[PDB]
């Protein structure tokens, strides 16, 4: 677990989201992916 912004089996940081599970980090920040930064 390191390349959060790469072609993983999930959605990378710099990608769009649908559900937290869609994002590699399991964090759906306003329909977008990101790290442990759910503040905006």
Swiss-Prot record:
Highest taxon of the source?
A: Eukaryota
A Gene Ontology biological process in which this protein takes part is: defense response to bacterium
Keyword set includes Membrane: no
Where is this protein found? Answer: Secreted
**Which pairs are disulfide-linked?**
17-28, 23-33
Please give the chief subcellular localization of this protein. Answer: secreted
Which UniProt keyword terms apply here? Antibiotic, Antimicrobial, Cleavage on pair of basic residues, Disulfide bond, Secreted, Signal
Q: Which GO terms describe its cellular component?
A: extracellular region
Name the family.
Belongs to the LEAP2 family.
Primary role = Has an antimicrobial activity.
Q: What is this protein called?
A: Liver-expressed antimicrobial peptide 2
Q: Which organism is it from?
A: Homo sapiens
């Amino acid at each position: 677990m390191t390349p959060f912004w790469r072609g993983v089996s999930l959605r990378p940081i710099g990608a769009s989201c649908r559900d937290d599970s869609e994002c590699i980090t399991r964090l759906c920040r306003k329909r977008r992916c990101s790290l442990s930064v759910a503040q905006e």
